[PDB]
Design an enzyme around this catalytic site. Structure first.
Site, PDB file in Angstrom:
ATOM      1  N   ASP A 283     -29.847 -29.928  24.784  1.00 23.84           N
ATOM      2  CA  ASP A 283     -30.830 -30.371  25.564  1.00 23.84           C
ATOM      3  C   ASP A 283     -32.248 -29.753  25.814  1.00 23.84           C
ATOM      4  OD1 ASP A 283     -28.918 -32.527  25.751  1.00 23.84           O
ATOM      5  OD2 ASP A 283     -28.767 -32.258  27.780  1.00 23.84           O
TER       6      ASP A 283
ATOM      7  N   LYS B 151     -34.611 -27.784  20.607  1.00 19.69           N
ATOM      8  CA  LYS B 151     -34.258 -27.550  19.126  1.00 19.69           C
ATOM      9  C   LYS B 151     -34.822 -28.762  18.144  1.00 19.69           C
ATOM     10  CE  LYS B 151     -29.855 -26.843  19.717  1.00 19.69           C
ATOM     11  NZ  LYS B 151     -29.584 -27.593  20.888  1.00 19.69           N
ATOM     12  N   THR B 152     -34.456 -29.945  18.547  1.00 15.78           N
ATOM     13  CA  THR B 152     -34.676 -30.983  17.597  1.00 15.78           C
ATOM     14  C   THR B 152     -35.949 -31.519  17.720  1.00 15.78           C
ATOM     15  OG1 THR B 152     -32.517 -31.708  17.467  1.00 15.78           O
ATOM     16  CG2 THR B 152     -33.859 -33.409  16.845  1.00 15.78           C
TER      17      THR B 152
ATOM     18  N   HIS C 185     -23.235 -27.501  19.528  1.00 16.05           N
ATOM     19  CA  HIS C 185     -22.567 -26.423  19.544  1.00 16.05           C
ATOM     20  C   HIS C 185     -21.581 -25.951  18.593  1.00 16.05           C
ATOM     21  CE1 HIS C 185     -21.673 -22.508  21.124  1.00 16.05           C
ATOM     22  NE2 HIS C 185     -20.274 -22.910  21.378  1.00 16.05           N
TER      23      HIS C 185
END
Ligand SMILES: Nc1nc2c(ncn2[C@@H]2O[C@H](COP(=O)(O)OP(=O)(O)O)[C@@H](O)[C@H]2O)c(=O)[nH]1
Ligand SMILES: [Mg+2]
Lengths: 119, 384, 154
Positions: B12, B15-16, B75
């Site tokens: 959250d 990263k994306t 992860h």
């Protein structure tokens, strides 16, 4: 049983009809968020703000990763609560009927507490 | 000029959204193709050695470089990709939320970063649109620099960009310069990846013969470097490193002055006999690689679903360690307060081989049982 | 004065006397370990104060429970934070852990917060509330809570 086994078990007692935490979900839950860090009021307000924005997207991803229709009128519930260091991800969601309150398996733990959910 | 990178950090933290932002801001400024959050977030499955990893591969270009960038949902995916994943990261973008600060996967992804041999880390401090006070941003930067230096990364000298992936992706020209800044630091901070051809000579030995009159020849692919005829060479591996000289280099009957990286050659040696070459030995440029029996590793043990073990193993586990060409036995030492390793786990693991293999930090290997793979690891720290 | 604060922080033994029975002030309520403060607390050990106890901040995003900072002060906060972080490296988590829980990050953020606000307290002359707390940190303990006039500490 791990703290997570207790969390998943408690959550399945409340799960909406057709919204159970499947063994597959429980595997992905454990692998993707084994260790959590307690959040502050501010930090939890920030995570809640992001969830509200992406709710419909995350619900559609739950439907696609579990192959199930989202139960009519079901509320997206966080299996690991956001205030406990939970995530805004399909695998941390579960359909419940009505907004049920959250907690964690006495005073609240201070922000920054690290809880290893496998222990 | 091609560089492997990607995004790491806690769920959250952005990263994306950041990966998405980078593609659009670079495509808008320098040319290329914008990639949506959706297509990146919903990563497809990769299957290396029957290991499942959810992985998005984006490409983006700076004026001077081409980037291949990996981004994963969970992860779990990052653990597998750092230990086992095909392309090793030349540098990583650690994404930290200025809201939450470093969280357990912020610390885990830095720890595994060191263990796996990720040479450089750059930092994007995200969600700065939600955190107005600078002292908070300053104190979070200080939390990160000290976390980096705790695992031997140059925390003081680390580039840290204060930005907003969401606002940059939404088209806000204020937050777009922060993405160009970050990409700038990819171009400046990460050095040109060290090419295999330029590295010191190394050839894993795959076969051995004795040619008529000429003497001993060892076959194999040259992993790196160049071996010229009449150069010194050491035979590092199962026994005391052996000193010899390359008297020739033939490739399918044709004599050569040099054997180059990527080529399959026979390497003619001096003095050394056919019976002194062993399984798992390498030819190497003298004094550049050394034999090791004991080492620290990070390992991922395959789940049952990935065709791994069905049962857990204990301290008394004695598997085969396949490094390059052949298996070698070893006893394991588990970390403190741990006496069991389930299928689909990843632990730090101290290994003692019954005889040594030429290795540096960062060498990849497999744990095996009777031919079939049950684990994949990386040498974190050679010892002994 | 802030220079002699740095020296005293640089020579401190933070968290070194946790659980130990040193002398201490009247407001202090010593509790043995993290388990009996955060996990399995008894009203006897809290001396009847459990219901009023509120954890002192353990995150820089929390608010001051006691009281625009002059940019001169803001910097003094940066510099005392760095110094407190230098004095709180590699803490044995054995003393900060019970069952699945680890409190060492909460403790480190908590000692950093208390010293930042102590600096705001003495610079602005707000009072003695953080001075009370920072004194307990210098004695080698962790003030974890505040119950009326009392301060719960390990
Ligand atoms: N306000 C704000 N939200 C952000 C920012 N970056 C990411 N987010 C939000 O964070 C949530 C998760 O982002 P994501 O990229 O999926 O995080 P990841 O799990 O690390 O890939 C989404 O709601 C995003 O809208 C940012 O800069 N500002
Ligand atoms: Mg993602």
């Amino acid at each position: 049983c791990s703290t997570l086994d207790r969390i998943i078990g408690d959550a399945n007692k409340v799960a909406s009809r057709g919204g159970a935490i499947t063994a597959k979900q429980a595997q992905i839950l454990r692998d993707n968020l084994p260790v959590v860090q307690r959040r502050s009021v501010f930090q939890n307000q920030m995570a809640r703000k992001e969830f509200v924005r992406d709710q419909h997207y995350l619900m559609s991803q739950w439907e696609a990763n579990t192959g199930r229709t989202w139960p009519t009128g079901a509320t997206p519930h966080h299996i690991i609560p956001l205030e406990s260091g939970g995530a805004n991800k399909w695998w941390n969601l579960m359909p419940t009927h009505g907004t049920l309150p959250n907690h964690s398996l006495r005073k609240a733990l201070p922000p920054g507490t690290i809880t290893d959910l496998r222990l | 000029p091609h560089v492997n990178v990607g995004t790491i950090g806690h769920v959250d933290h952005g990263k994306t959204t950041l990966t998405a932002a980078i593609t659009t801001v670079l495509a808008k400024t320098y040319g290329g193709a914008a990639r949506a959050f959706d297509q990146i977030d919903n990563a497809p499955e990769e299957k290396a050695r029957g290991i499942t990893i959810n992985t998005s591969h984006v490409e983006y270009d700076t004026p001077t470089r081409h980037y291949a960038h990996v981004d994963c949902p969970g992860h779990a995916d990052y653990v597998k990709n750092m230990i086992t994943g095909a392309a090793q990261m030349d540098g990583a973008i650690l994404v930290v939320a200025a809201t939450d600060g470093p969280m357990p996967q912020t610390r885990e992804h830095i720890l595994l970063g060191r263990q796996v041999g990720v040479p450089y880390i750059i930092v994007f401090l995200n969600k700065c649109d939600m955190v107005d006070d600078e002292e908070l941003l300053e104190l979070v930067e200080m939390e990160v620099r000290e976390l980096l230096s705790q695992y031997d990364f140059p925390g003081d000298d680390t580039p840290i960009v204060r930005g907003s992936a969401l606002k940059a992706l939404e088209g806000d020209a204020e937050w777009e310069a922060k993405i160009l800044e970050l990409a700038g630091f990819l171009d400046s901070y990460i050095p040109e990846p060290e090419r295999a051809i330029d590295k010191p000579f190394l050839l894993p030995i795959e076969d051995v013969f004795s040619i008529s009159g000429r003497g001993t020849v060892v076959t194999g692919r040259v992993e790196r470097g160049i071996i010229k005829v009449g150069e010194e060479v050491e035979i590092v591996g199962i026994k005391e490193t052996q000193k010899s000289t390359c008297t020739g280099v033939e490739m399918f009957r044709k004599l050569l002055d040099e054997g180059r990286a990527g080529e399959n050659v026979g390497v003619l040696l001096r003095g050394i006999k056919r019976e002194e070459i062993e399984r798992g030995q390498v030819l190497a440029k003298p004094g550049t690689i050394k034999p090791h029996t004991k080492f620290e590793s990070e390992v991922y043990i395959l789940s049952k679903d990935e065709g791994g073990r069905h049962t857990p193993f204990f301290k008394g586990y004695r598997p085969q360690f396949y490094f390059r060409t052949t298996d070698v036995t070893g006893t394991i030492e588990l970390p403190e307060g741990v006496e069991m390793v389930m299928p689909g786990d990843n632990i730090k693991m101290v290994v003692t081989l019954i005889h040594p293999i030429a290795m540096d930090d960062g060498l990849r290997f497999a744990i095996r049982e009777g031919g079939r793979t049950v684990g994949a690891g990386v040498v974190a720290k050679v010892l002994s | 004065d802030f220079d002699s604060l740095l020296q005293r922080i640089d020579s401190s033994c933070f968290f070194s006397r946790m659980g130990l029975p040193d002398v201490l002030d009247s407001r202090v309520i010593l509790i043995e370990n993290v388990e009996k403060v955060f996990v399995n607390p008894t009203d006897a050990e809290f001396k009847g104060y459990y219901d009023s106890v509120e954890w002192l901040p353990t995150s820089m995003t929390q608010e001051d429970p006691f009281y625009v900072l002059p940019k001169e002060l803001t910097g003094l906060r940066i510099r005392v934070n760095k110094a407190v972080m230098n004095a709180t490296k590699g803490l044995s988590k054995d003393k900060f852990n019970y069952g699945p829980h680890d409190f060492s990050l909460a403790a480190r953020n908590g000692i950093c917060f208390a010293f930042r606000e102590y600096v705001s307290e003495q610079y602005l002359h707000l009072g003695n509330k953080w001075e009370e707390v920072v004194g307990i940190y210098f004695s080698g303990h962790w003030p974890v809570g505040i119950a009326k006039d009392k301060i719960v500490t390990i």
